């Protein structure tokens, strides 16, 4: 569900990605770390919401969801429920219900100067031969020798 053009509870009411998303996703299983012998109930997800979230929009509202015509005054009932639910992670749960750690990287390039990008690959230095050289973007052809 963490991909452009998807649908589902997570893709709609938990985390929505833009359709022109730049960057990408790295995810890996973390059962050996996020699992408890008695059941780990520390991770929540939103189950009830009126409408889908906009891309890159977070919602930490913890008001009681209204599922009927009667507006409750903050006390849960037959049609008033907490919109957050706890996961049932268990280390013996089958693959598909096991915890996974997910990171999404998004690259933004603005009119401002570019600042974040990869290391520059340098080669060795040789002297006393006519070569093509490139030092810090300055290119040329010639022989390099020791100076005073």
């Amino acid at each position, epitope marked *: 569900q963490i991909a452009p053009g998807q649908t589902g509870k997570i893709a709609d009411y938990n985390y929505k990605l833009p359709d022109d998303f730049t960057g990408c996703v790295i995810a890996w*299983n*973390s*059962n*050996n*770390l996020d*699992s*408890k*012998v*008695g059941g*780990n109930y520390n991770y929540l997800y939103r189950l009830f919401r009126k409408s889908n979230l906009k891309p890159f929009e977070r919602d930490i509202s913890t008001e009681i969801y209204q599922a009927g015509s009667t507006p409750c005054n903050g006390v849960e009932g037959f049609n008033c429920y907490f919109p957050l639910q706890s996961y049932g992670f268990q*280390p*013996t749960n089958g693959v598909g219900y*096991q915890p996974y750690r997910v990171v999404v990287l998004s690259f933004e390039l603005l009119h401002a100067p570019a600042t974040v990008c990869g290391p520059k690959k340098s080669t060795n230095l040789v002297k006393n031969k006519c070569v093509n050289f490139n030092f810090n973007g300055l290119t040329g052809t010639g022989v390099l020798t020791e100076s005073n």
Partner: antibody
Amino acid sequence: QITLKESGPTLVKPTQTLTLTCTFSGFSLSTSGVGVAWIRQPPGKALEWLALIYWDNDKRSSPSLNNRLTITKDTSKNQVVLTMTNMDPEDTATYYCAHFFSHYDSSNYYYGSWFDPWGQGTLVTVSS
Amino acid sequence: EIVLTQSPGTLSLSPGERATLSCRASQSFDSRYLGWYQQKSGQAPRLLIYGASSRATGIPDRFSGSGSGTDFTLTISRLEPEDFAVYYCQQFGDSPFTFGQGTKLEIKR
């Protein structure tokens, strides 16, 4: 190899508080999958688990005694402190502190969990 | 809670024969949550088998286990007088984690 020794006052009057301390060597409370358990056994009767502490500060206590159970950890000095309040005269038992570790092999399959070496155990009698 | 019952209450044999013990669970849970521990007289219990299918470090091959559903069994083929003690079966299915009442292995004469 790991060692775990118990300590604390063994003579406690009724309906005051009791505090036991377990000192452990050969392992630290920072490794993944490492926890410390406190268990008690009344003399002549079966064992009874009391509490569990995880490496990531997660705590588990007995549902019936969770009102009067507390567990704390000291990583630098490697100590585990267990505190009970409102002691009962029927709580006379022997207390053990044990290591806890689960087995995973590069694929997160959880080949069961166990109680690897425990402590010596200290005798606690609560009477007036 | 989950209740584990050990059968029989007391089992006494002679040194040399095979010893069989059973641990039955009140409810049904994963077979990987069941383990067995050994306690001697005036000594702290030690890990014996974990996961109901795996032997612990240094545990002799004489000790074996098999079970599923709500029933498990432990088998000893050639027992020596150094293993007449009490055995506990334990579960991890549901909090609180409970121990069996124990079965005492007695030397027969």
